Amino acid sequence: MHTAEFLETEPTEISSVLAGGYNHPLLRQWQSERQLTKNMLIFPLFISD
Amino acid sequence: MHTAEFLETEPTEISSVLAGGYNHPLLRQWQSERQLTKNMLIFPLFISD
Incomplete structure (x- = not known):
């Protein structure tokens, strides 16, 4: 069945x-x-007359 | 005698x-x-010991 897919990831870049x-x-x-x-x-x- | 001298002047420039x-x-x-x-x-x- 449909399961949550999680892509492989590289370490976090500090700039992100x-x-x-x-x-x-x-x-x-x-x-x-x-x-x-x-x-x-x-x-x-608004000043009046 | 010494009197206060004032030089002739042109009109004021807005930029000044x-x-x-x-x-x-x-x-x-x-x-x-x-x-x-x-x-x-x-x-x-400055926290002390």
């Missing part, structure tokens, strides 16, 4: 491994080129 | 004007490529 850099919540923040702060916001106002 | 971009406290923050946050800090600990 990106995972060490984003496996934790903090790391996902370390990963942003820039973090969002309150002073970056500009709120629009 | 950088001042419009950092004349206010907020602008000096807008000017940073990256702002400092608490999550960017890593504190070293």
